[PDB]
Design an enzyme around this catalytic site. Sequence first.
Site, PDB file in Angstrom:
ATOM      1  N   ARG A   1       1.555 -18.376  -9.884  1.00  0.00           N
ATOM      2  CA  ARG A   1       1.037 -18.386 -11.262  1.00  0.00           C
ATOM      3  C   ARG A   1       0.208 -17.122 -11.578  1.00  0.00           C
ATOM      4  O   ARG A   1       0.023 -16.747 -12.749  1.00  0.00           O
ATOM      5  CB  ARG A   1       0.195 -19.651 -11.525  1.00  0.00           C
ATOM      6  CG  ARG A   1      -1.062 -19.693 -10.668  1.00  0.00           C
ATOM      7  CD  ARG A   1      -2.047 -20.805 -10.977  1.00  0.00           C
ATOM      8  NE  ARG A   1      -3.041 -20.843  -9.895  1.00  0.00           N
ATOM      9  CZ  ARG A   1      -2.887 -21.510  -8.744  1.00  0.00           C
ATOM     10  NH1 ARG A   1      -1.794 -22.234  -8.523  1.00  0.00           N
ATOM     11  NH2 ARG A   1      -3.833 -21.468  -7.814  1.00  0.00           N
ATOM     12  N   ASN A   2      -0.283 -16.470 -10.524  1.00  0.00           N
ATOM     13  CA  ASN A   2      -1.121 -15.284 -10.673  1.00  0.00           C
ATOM     14  C   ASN A   2      -0.411 -13.990 -10.366  1.00  0.00           C
ATOM     15  O   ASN A   2      -1.047 -12.950 -10.189  1.00  0.00           O
ATOM     16  CB  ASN A   2      -2.388 -15.418  -9.823  1.00  0.00           C
ATOM     17  CG  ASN A   2      -3.322 -16.457 -10.371  1.00  0.00           C
ATOM     18  OD1 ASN A   2      -3.279 -16.759 -11.558  1.00  0.00           O
ATOM     19  ND2 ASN A   2      -4.151 -17.027  -9.519  1.00  0.00           N
TER      20      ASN A   2
ATOM     21  N   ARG B   1      -4.165 -19.404 -20.601  1.00  0.00           N
ATOM     22  CA  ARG B   1      -5.517 -19.919 -20.478  1.00  0.00           C
ATOM     23  C   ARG B   1      -6.035 -19.609 -19.078  1.00  0.00           C
ATOM     24  O   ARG B   1      -5.447 -20.019 -18.072  1.00  0.00           O
ATOM     25  CB  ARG B   1      -5.535 -21.436 -20.725  1.00  0.00           C
ATOM     26  CG  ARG B   1      -6.284 -21.861 -21.976  1.00  0.00           C
ATOM     27  CD  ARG B   1      -5.440 -22.708 -22.924  1.00  0.00           C
ATOM     28  NE  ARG B   1      -4.778 -23.850 -22.284  1.00  0.00           N
ATOM     29  CZ  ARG B   1      -3.836 -24.594 -22.865  1.00  0.00           C
ATOM     30  NH1 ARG B   1      -3.431 -24.319 -24.098  1.00  0.00           N
ATOM     31  NH2 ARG B   1      -3.296 -25.623 -22.214  1.00  0.00           N
TER      32      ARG B   1
ATOM     33  N   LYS C   1      -8.203 -10.480 -22.116  1.00  0.00           N
ATOM     34  CA  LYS C   1      -8.920 -11.624 -21.543  1.00  0.00           C
ATOM     35  C   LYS C   1     -10.233 -11.840 -22.256  1.00  0.00           C
ATOM     36  O   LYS C   1     -10.986 -10.884 -22.459  1.00  0.00           O
ATOM     37  CB  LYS C   1      -9.228 -11.381 -20.072  1.00  0.00           C
ATOM     38  CG  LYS C   1      -8.133 -11.757 -19.103  1.00  0.00           C
ATOM     39  CD  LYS C   1      -8.759 -11.954 -17.725  1.00  0.00           C
ATOM     40  CE  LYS C   1      -8.098 -13.094 -16.968  1.00  0.00           C
ATOM     41  NZ  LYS C   1      -8.120 -12.811 -15.502  1.00  0.00           N
TER      42      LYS C   1
ATOM     43  N   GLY D   1     -11.473 -18.408 -20.293  1.00  0.00           N
ATOM     44  CA  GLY D   1     -11.022 -18.620 -21.662  1.00  0.00           C
ATOM     45  C   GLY D   1      -9.604 -18.125 -21.880  1.00  0.00           C
ATOM     46  O   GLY D   1      -8.898 -17.785 -20.930  1.00  0.00           O
ATOM     47  N   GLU D   2      -9.204 -18.086 -23.145  1.00  0.00           N
ATOM     48  CA  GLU D   2      -7.872 -17.721 -23.544  1.00  0.00           C
ATOM     49  C   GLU D   2      -7.541 -16.276 -23.186  1.00  0.00           C
ATOM     50  O   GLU D   2      -8.414 -15.409 -23.173  1.00  0.00           O
ATOM     51  CB  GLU D   2      -7.731 -17.908 -25.059  1.00  0.00           C
ATOM     52  CG  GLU D   2      -7.775 -19.356 -25.533  1.00  0.00           C
ATOM     53  CD  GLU D   2      -9.162 -20.001 -25.510  1.00  0.00           C
ATOM     54  OE1 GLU D   2     -10.205 -19.308 -25.395  1.00  0.00           O
ATOM     55  OE2 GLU D   2      -9.197 -21.242 -25.607  1.00  0.00           O
TER      56      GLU D   2
ATOM     57  N   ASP E   1      -7.259 -15.530  -4.843  1.00  0.00           N
ATOM     58  CA  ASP E   1      -6.559 -16.431  -5.781  1.00  0.00           C
ATOM     59  C   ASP E   1      -5.077 -16.095  -5.873  1.00  0.00           C
ATOM     60  O   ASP E   1      -4.479 -16.139  -6.964  1.00  0.00           O
ATOM     61  CB  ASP E   1      -7.236 -16.364  -7.170  1.00  0.00           C
ATOM     62  CG  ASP E   1      -7.036 -17.638  -8.017  1.00  0.00           C
ATOM     63  OD1 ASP E   1      -6.316 -18.594  -7.611  1.00  0.00           O
ATOM     64  OD2 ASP E   1      -7.614 -17.670  -9.124  1.00  0.00           O
TER      65      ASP E   1
ATOM     66  N   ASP F   1      -4.871 -11.382 -12.108  1.00  0.00           N
ATOM     67  CA  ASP F   1      -5.980 -12.352 -12.044  1.00  0.00           C
ATOM     68  C   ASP F   1      -6.972 -12.083 -10.904  1.00  0.00           C
ATOM     69  O   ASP F   1      -7.001 -12.794  -9.901  1.00  0.00           O
ATOM     70  CB  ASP F   1      -5.427 -13.784 -12.043  1.00  0.00           C
ATOM     71  CG  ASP F   1      -4.550 -14.057 -13.276  1.00  0.00           C
ATOM     72  OD1 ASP F   1      -5.082 -14.572 -14.278  1.00  0.00           O
ATOM     73  OD2 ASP F   1      -3.338 -13.706 -13.267  1.00  0.00           O
TER      74      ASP F   1
HETATM   75  C1  LIG Z   1       4.258 -13.162 -21.456  1.00  0.00           C
HETATM   76  C2  LIG Z   1       3.093 -13.550 -20.626  1.00  0.00           C
HETATM   77  C3  LIG Z   1       2.850 -14.875 -20.349  1.00  0.00           C
HETATM   78  C4  LIG Z   1       1.768 -15.236 -19.577  1.00  0.00           C
HETATM   79  C5  LIG Z   1       0.919 -14.273 -19.081  1.00  0.00           C
HETATM   80  C6  LIG Z   1       1.169 -12.952 -19.368  1.00  0.00           C
HETATM   81  N1  LIG Z   1       0.363 -11.926 -18.920  1.00  0.00           N
HETATM   82  C7  LIG Z   1      -0.868 -12.024 -18.297  1.00  0.00           C
HETATM   83  N2  LIG Z   1      -1.425 -13.200 -17.962  1.00  0.00           N
HETATM   84  C8  LIG Z   1      -2.625 -13.171 -17.349  1.00  0.00           C
HETATM   85  N3  LIG Z   1      -3.303 -14.351 -16.948  1.00  0.00           N
HETATM   86  C9  LIG Z   1      -2.515 -15.578 -17.067  1.00  0.00           C
HETATM   87  C10 LIG Z   1      -3.422 -16.795 -17.022  1.00  0.00           C
HETATM   88  C11 LIG Z   1      -2.605 -18.066 -17.217  1.00  0.00           C
HETATM   89  C12 LIG Z   1      -1.447 -18.182 -16.241  1.00  0.00           C
HETATM   90  C13 LIG Z   1      -0.585 -16.942 -16.279  1.00  0.00           C
HETATM   91  C14 LIG Z   1      -1.418 -15.705 -16.016  1.00  0.00           C
HETATM   92  N4  LIG Z   1      -1.938 -15.764 -14.660  1.00  0.00           N
HETATM   93  C15 LIG Z   1      -3.262 -11.978 -17.075  1.00  0.00           C
HETATM   94  C16 LIG Z   1      -4.522 -11.879 -16.411  1.00  0.00           C
HETATM   95  N5  LIG Z   1      -5.494 -11.779 -15.769  1.00  0.00           N
HETATM   96  C17 LIG Z   1      -2.682 -10.774 -17.416  1.00  0.00           C
HETATM   97  C18 LIG Z   1      -1.464 -10.809 -18.042  1.00  0.00           C
HETATM   98  C19 LIG Z   1      -0.837  -9.526 -18.400  1.00  0.00           C
HETATM   99  N6  LIG Z   1      -1.622  -8.485 -18.014  1.00  0.00           N
HETATM  100  O1  LIG Z   1       0.248  -9.450 -18.971  1.00  0.00           O
HETATM  101  C20 LIG Z   1       2.252 -12.585 -20.135  1.00  0.00           C
END
Ligand SMILES: Cc1cccc(Nc2nc(N[C@@H]3CCCC[C@@H]3N)c(C#N)cc2C(N)=O)c1
Length: 372
Positions: free
Chosen positions: A238-239, A120, A141, A124-125, A234, A252
């Site tokens: 977590r990012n 999230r 995204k 959004g999701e 940011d 992010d």
């Molecule tokens: C297995 C798995 C689990 C979780 C995330 C990801 N991957 C990502 N997550 C993201 N935003 C998320 C928002 C919520 C907190 C975690 C991340 N910062 C973003 C962005 N932009 C890109 C990815 C990516 N390109 O794979 C893959």
Amino acid sequence: EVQKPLHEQLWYHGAIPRAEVAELLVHSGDFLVRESQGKQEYVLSVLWDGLPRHFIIQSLDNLYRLEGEGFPSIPLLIDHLLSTQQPLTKKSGVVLHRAVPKDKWVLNHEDLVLGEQIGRGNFGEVFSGRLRADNTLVAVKSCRETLPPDLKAKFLQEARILKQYSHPNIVRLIGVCTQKQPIYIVMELVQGGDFLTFLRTEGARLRVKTLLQMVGDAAAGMEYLESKCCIHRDLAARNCLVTEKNVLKISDFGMSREEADGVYAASGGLRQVPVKWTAPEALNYGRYSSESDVWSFGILLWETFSLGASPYPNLSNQQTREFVEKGGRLPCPELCPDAVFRLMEQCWAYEPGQRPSFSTIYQELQSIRKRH
Ligand SMILES: Cc1cccc(Nc2nc(N[C@@H]3CCCC[C@@H]3N)c(C#N)cc2C(N)=O)c1
């Protein structure tokens, strides 16, 4: 070309928002066709007297027109207007000069299949997904339609920024689905997920050498960003994302800003600002820079060596600002090597000019890693 359906035309941008339209139209007579999401009609957008002018393309008896002749397709109408150089309306005197094509990053919705929700974000999701052509796994995204117009206008910033980048420690953009609603930003899926979860889950088993290599990756990414005049704003565990081979990538980029002279002045009105990761001058005066990112990197070092502890747990955001103004800083984690903590303390120098460069950070972490 002129016989191809509208949806295949290079100059047809579909669900492109108004702000991106102004970005793309550079010279007098520059034009594109899009679909008005609100009105459900086709729109011809043309730069004239420095500002985009929007004309609704009328349709009747399967013929498309403005205030002149009608044509059985919009590409035939556009060809007519461009070739005859007739004003779009007598009143406006607007004349077409150059069709603005889509860039290489525009992706059709049909090229993508959405999978499970993986996270999230502020807009959004975020979903996992796959490109249908080759089974490339992607992260997708989304942007909620109910967000304030002023914040929705910012959604495509992450894509505009990442279009320019290529580095092993920066998340890779694959494309943007802006031809229809809902609008998506499509990136490489980093399968190991976020670094904070990684630290908390795999904590006990992680060697100090491994931790130093991962934050070393983060420092290389940030060094690259600084070289591109990018202020991330940011940066936090977590990012950051972890590959299957334990490589870290910075992710992010929604809040990130490019500034040639190295300083971004914030609006002041940002919601959900990551106060505990943010430098004092950025909060106090809206002054963001690579030096404020260095402060955040210090917090990231702290998160890494505390194996994902939450910073300033007993304090609210406001209490954290007050604490930091008094000289309060985060304590040394027990698994943190003395030298890492000295670097961390330098990252949290109150004055931005006193903090180390990302080059220095990268080189210092590397030297420490060669001991362990
Ligand atoms: C297995 C798995 C689990 C979780 C995330 C990801 N991957 C990502 N997550 C993201 N935003 C998320 C928002 C919520 C907190 C975690 C991340 N910062 C973003 C962005 N932009 C890109 C990815 C990516 N390109 O794979 C893959």
